[PDB]
């Protein structure tokens, strides 16, 4: 990698990884180099297993959409897999919105549409992100008139595809009744993101992580007027149709885009 | 290295998911092995070949394992089109075929083979590896032409390491993630119950007339011991089976408990 990219400042660090800014030799174009520490022994809990690195890389390879982070190049050395990624410098969407004194529902929906467009692309390729949250919703450049959303961090993303067992004769009840996680999980996350984007309030947050998890499982939220008095009924309906316990009864991404609140712009 | 530079390749032995198995012999030692050639999926291909992720997952499992009752990985090569696993040659066929050839087979003899299965699984589970496909066709013998044949568990194509897992905020996670119950080592213990039931009786506990019936029967744990298939089976053996065919995975015998059970231990 160092033969081909000049490495600069550390930008941050996450799950067994350090991100540095870099510049490609010959072209001068800037990127983010994410150095992922490989797991050595399969018994270890340090680093990332090769198979999990591959899972993420295989998803990143396929992505070509303006609202998603792009993979440019990949290297591997003794200790690391280095992803050369699109440099996204505009920060978290919510930190940009914080510079404002207030935000209108129409200003918010400009951004929400971009998130939905990114997720529509991912879901069209059967990719569930599984960790949609405001910190993974960045901006390419926050100083332009109409900033562009970039979805980041495919660390737990999966392709969503019985036959592997040959027949079911020997399989346990938990396999018979296995209900896989799927694309609907992202649609729930979108509901929560929308809720907080519009109101500033987190719908399920409790005093401990355990309380939050309890609240989520019970679908225990409201639209209290202290937070929702300037929010439209169509916005509330959109959220209601996402925050559904049964994943099979939630709006899909296509239905989300066809919802009157979104169609209206 | 290229595989042909180290191994003389021989005749074809079988086929797997986008795979061919050939007998081979190591140059420099004369020792025979099974070479499994797995076709890699191209980046432009949707369904042809096996994904790199799936090959790595299985290989990383195989690399870790060494135990007398599990197939051993000896070498790995990769060329343009394939990943090639050089595996221990397991020549003795299916356990159940060998047993079906015996004039008679006592419960004591059956338990001794079953113990070898348990020993292999005990090792796998000690590494947090669930096999997930334990069934007769994956229980082979190394060499059937010896007084006491050695069981070899094969086919780690759906095996997985087993690890509420959320390091950051849980605020945006869906209820199905909050309530997610992953498949675990207990699933293998269920399979061992079914294997044992068939081993002793020749009947299958949950098999229905259609796939849906089999599924329904498993989920309901709807089985019994027919009087005229279990007439020569001990209550102690039935107890072993009963403690494995339990709906709640948390209430099934673990591999350690299975080995401590008096059917095995006595």
Residue B185's closest chain A neighbor by CA? Answer: A172
Residue A132: list chain B partners with CB under 8 A: 172
Here the tokens at position B35 are 């070479």
Nearest-angstrom CA–CA distance, A235 and A194: 9
Nearest-angstrom CA–CA distance, A69 and B184: 34
Nearest-angstrom CA–CA distance, B34 and B18: 16
- DSSP state, residue B50: B
To probe the interface with B, which of A48, A157, A169, A177 has the most B CB atoms within 10 Å? Answer: A169
Cβ(B123)–Cβ(B130) under 8 Å? no
Residue A193's closest chain B neighbor by CA? Answer: B172
Helix (H, G, I), strand (E, B) or coil at B106: coil
Nearest-angstrom CA–CA distance, A186 and B186: 30
Helix (H, G, I), strand (E, B) or coil at B104: coil
Contact B176 A169 (CB under 8 A): no
CA pseudo-torsion sign A194, A196, A199, A200: negative
Cβ(B207)–Cβ(B223) under 8 Å? no
Cβ(B117)–Cβ(B69) under 8 Å? yes
Here the tokens at position A43 are 């018994």
Helix (H, G, I), strand (E, B) or coil at B103: coil
To probe the interface with A, which of B168, B175, B180, B253 has the most A CB atoms within 10 Å? Answer: B175
Nearest by CB to residue B218, choosing from A42, A168, A219, is A168
Do B2-92 and B93-266 agree at the fold level? no
Topology given in CATH for the domain delimited by A91-265: Transferase(Phosphotransferase); domain 1 (1.10.510)
Chain A / chain B CB contacts < 8 angstroms: 136
Q: Where are the beta strands (DSSP E) in chain B?
A: 7-16, 19-26, 32-39, 73-78, 82-88, 129-130, 139-141, 151-153, 160-161
Residue A53 to residues A78, B166, B224, B265, Cα–Cα distance (Å): 15, 18, 46, 43
Q: How far is B45 from chain A (nearest CA, A)?
A: 12
- DSSP state, residue B1: -
Give the CB-side neighbour count of residue B47, counting CA atoms within 13 A: 1
Check B119, B133, B226, B239 and give the catalytic one.
B133
The response to whether B114 counts as a known ligand-binding position is no
The architecture in CATH of the region B93-266 reads Orthogonal Bundle (1.10)
Q: How many of the other CB atoms lie within 10 Å of CB of A155?
A: 20
Helix (H, G, I), strand (E, B) or coil at B18: coil
Active site residue A131: yes
Residue B169: list chain A partners with CB under 8 A: 133
Strands A127-128 and A158-159 come out as antiparallel
Whose tokens are 């050369």? That residue is: A84
Q: What kind of experiment solved this structure?
A: X-ray
CATH number of A1-90: 3.30.200.20
Q: Which residues are B210's β-sheet partners?
A: none
Nearest-angstrom CA–CA distance, A192 and A220: 12
Rounded to the nearest 10 degrees, how much is the dihedral formed by the CA atoms of B9, B14, B19, B22? Answer: -10
Question: How many helices (H) and strands (E) are present in chain B, helices listed first?
Answer: 10, 9
Residue A194's closest chain B neighbor by CA? Answer: B172
Sheet holding B19-26, edge to edge: B7-16, B19-26, B32-39, B82-88, B73-78
Residue B181: list chain A partners with CB under 8 A: 174
Contact B194 A133 (CB under 8 A): no
Tell which residue, B3, B177, B26, B166, has the closest CA to residue B82.
B3
Cβ(B204)–Cβ(B195) under 8 Å? no
Cβ(A92)–Cβ(A135) under 8 Å? yes
Tell which residue, A104, A99, A84, A87, has the closest CA to residue A5.
A84
Nearest-angstrom CA–CA distance, B170 and B185: 27
Strands B139-141 and B151-153 come out as antiparallel
Residue A93 to residues A88, A129, A133, B57, Cα–Cα distance (Å): 12, 18, 11, 36
Contact A245 B134 (CB under 8 A): no
**3-state SS of chain A?**
CCCCEEEEEEEEEECCEEEEEEEECCCCCEEEEEEEEECCCCCCCCCECHHHHHHHHHHHHHCCCCCECCEEEEEECCCEEEEEEECCCCCEHHHHHCCCCCCCHHHHHHHHHHHHHHHHHHHHCCEECCCCCHHHEEECCCCCCCCCEEECCCCCCEECCCHHHCCCCCCCHHHHCCCCCCCHHHHHHHHHHHHHHHHCCCCCCCCCHHHHHHHHHCCCCCCCHHHHCCCCHHHHHHHHCCCCCCHHHCCCHHHHHHCHHHHCC
Q: What angle do CA B44, B48, B51 make, to 5 degrees?
A: 80
Nearest-angstrom CA–CA distance, A90 and A101: 19
Nearest-angstrom CA–CA distance, B110 and B198: 11
**Which residues have C-beta within 8 Å of that of residue B161, sequence separation ≥ 6?**
A42, B61, B127, B128, B129, B130
Tell which residue, B55, B60, B61, B64, has the closest CA to residue B37.
B55
Neighbour-count burial for A86-95, b at 16+ CB within 10 Å, e otherwise: bbbbbebbee
Here the tokens at position B255 are 């591999």
Give how far the C-alpha of residue A131 lies from the chain's centroid of Cα atoms, to the nearest Å. Answer: 5
Give how far the C-alpha of residue A184 lies from the chain's centroid of Cα atoms, to the nearest Å. Answer: 13
Burial class (CB in 10 A: 0-12, 13-18, 19+), B124: buried
Q: How many of the other CB atoms lie within 10 Å of CB of A113?
A: 15
Contact A185 B171 (CB under 8 A): no
The response to whether B16 counts as a known ligand-binding position is yes
Backbone angles phi, psi at A139, to 5 degrees: -120, 140
**Which residues have C-beta within 8 Å of that of residue A32, sequence separation ≥ 6?**
A11, A19, A20, A21, A22, A84, A85, A86, A87, A88
Q: How far is B173 from chain A (nearest CA, A)?
A: 6
Residue A164: list chain B partners with CB under 8 A: 133, 157-158
Nearest-angstrom CA–CA distance, A73 and A61: 9
Structural domain boundaries in chain A? 1-90, 91-265
Residue A177: list chain B partners with CB under 8 A: 219
Nearest-angstrom CA–CA distance, A153 and B173: 15
Nearest-angstrom CA–CA distance, B35 and A233: 65
Residue A42: list chain B partners with CB under 8 A: 60-61, 63-64, 127, 161
Here the tokens at position A233 are 């009924």
Cβ(B226)–Cβ(B203) under 8 Å? yes
Tell which residue, B65, B86, B87, B90, has the closest CA to residue B77.
B86
Nearest-angstrom CA–CA distance, A171 and B215: 9
Q: What angle do CA B14, B17, B19 make, to 5 degrees?
A: 50
**Which residues have C-beta within 8 Å of that of residue A128, sequence separation ≥ 6?**
A122, A157, A158, A159, A160, A181, A182, A183, A185, A186
Tell which residue, B178, B118, B133, has the closest CA to residue A209.
B178
Q: How far is B57 from chain A (nearest CA, A)?
A: 5
Q: What's the alpha-carbon Rg for chain A, to the nearest Å? A: 20
Q: How far is A26 from chain B (nearest CA, A)?
A: 27
Helix (H, G, I), strand (E, B) or coil at B35: strand
Q: Which residues are A79's β-sheet partners?
A: none
**Which residues precede a break in chain A, with C-to-N distance above 2.5 Å?**
161
Residue by residue, DSSP assigns B130-184 as E----SGGGEEES-SSSSSPPEEE---TT-EE------S--TT--HHHHT-----
Helix (H, G, I), strand (E, B) or coil at B58: helix
Check A80, A117, A131, A246 and give the catalytic one.
A131
Q: How many of the other CB atoms lie within 10 Å of CB of B73?
A: 21
CA pseudo-torsion sign B8, B13, B16, B20: positive
Q: How far is B25 from chain A (nearest CA, A)?
A: 29
Here the tokens at position B155 are 């086919």
Quick one: angle between helices B107-126 and B186-201, nearest 10? 170
Class of domain B2-92: alpha beta
């Amino acid at each position: 990698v160092e033969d081909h990219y000049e490495m600069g400042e550390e930008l941050g660090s996450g799950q067994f990884a350090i991100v540095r800014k870099c510049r490609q030799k010959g072209t001068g174009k800037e990127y983010a180099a994410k150095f992922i520490k490989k797991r050595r022994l399969s018994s270890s809990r340090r680093g990332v297993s090769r198979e999990e690195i591959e899972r993420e890389v295989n998803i990143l390879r396929e992505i070509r959409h303006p609202n998603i982070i792009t993979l440019h190049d990949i290297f591997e050395n003794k200790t690391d897999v280095v992803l050369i990624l699109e440099l996204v410098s505009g920060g978290e969407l919510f930190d940009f919105l914080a510079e404002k004194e207030s935000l209108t529902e129409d200003e918010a929906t400009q951004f929400l549409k971009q998130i939905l467009d990114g997720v529509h692309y991912l879901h069209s390729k059967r990719i569930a992100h599984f960790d949609l949250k405001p910190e993974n919703i960045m901006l390419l450049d926050k100083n332009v008139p109409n900033p562009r959303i970039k979805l980041i961090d495919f660390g737990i993303a999966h392709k969503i595809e019985k036959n592997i067992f040959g027949t079911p004769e020997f399989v346990a009840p938990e396999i018979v009744n296995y209900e896989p996680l799927g694309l609907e999980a992202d649609m729930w996350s979108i509901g929560v993101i929308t809720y907080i984007l519009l109101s500033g309030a987190s719908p399920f947050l409790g005093e401990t992580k355990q309380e939050t998890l309890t609240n989520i499982s019970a679908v225990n939220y409201d639209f209290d007027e202290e937070y929702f008095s300037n929010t439209s009924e169509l916005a509330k309906d959109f959220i209601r149709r996402l925050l559904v316990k049964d994943p099979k009864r939630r709006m899909t991404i296509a239905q989300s885009l066809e919802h009157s609140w979104i169609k209206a712009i």
